[PDB]
């Protein structure tokens, strides 16, 4: 269950 939200 990793953090999936995009980054820069």
């Amino acid at each position, epitope marked *: 269950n*990793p953090n999936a*939200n*995009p980054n820069a």
Partner: antibody
Amino acid sequence: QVQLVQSGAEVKKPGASVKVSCRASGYTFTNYAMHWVRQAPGQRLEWMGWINAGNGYTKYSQKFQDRVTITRDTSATTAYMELSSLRSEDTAMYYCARDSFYDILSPVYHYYGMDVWGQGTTVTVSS
Amino acid sequence: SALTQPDSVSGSPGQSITISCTGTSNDVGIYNHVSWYQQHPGKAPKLMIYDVNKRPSGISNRFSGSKSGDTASLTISGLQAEDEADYYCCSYAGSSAWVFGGGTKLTVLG
């Protein structure tokens, strides 16, 4: 109530661009992410990309990376999707859907799921 | 490329059915970020199952999800006529990307 309202139907020529909007209301806008998904007539759902409503960071699908731009306007609590160089097979219904967002300070149990969907916007590409 | 679902599944009222969703070792097999969506013709999809086996508020306990290896499965108990719809699975694919399944059409006989 919690809802996402999208803009109306679009009719475009091959090679044009289209920009669909998705206005949020009823919840804290910058606490979530927002997907854009499309569905050709009689076909399956296809993920295009998503954006963090807060910091605006995006990730697009490898099939659309060259043609799609997803943006957001926090002051209007609205997300936008622009698809360029339209072609015949881009004719589909386009949906916006809300999902979870976790920041840096979030150790939390990360779960996801497109829990709220817009009504959909039809885009018709024809000469 | 997408996740492989059966094209159609059929059942009669009261019967239970199961819809498969086969992925790879890069999506369904690794992450618990697996969701199921119900879509009636012409309407927006509706989240039925998230995090493999969890239901949102109000969703009937007739809908259940599970995962074994690379294949996620959605079970619908006590089949009713209102369950006739297209059902889609979706999985995290790494690198902040998501992938949808091909879709399954559920028909209720009788």
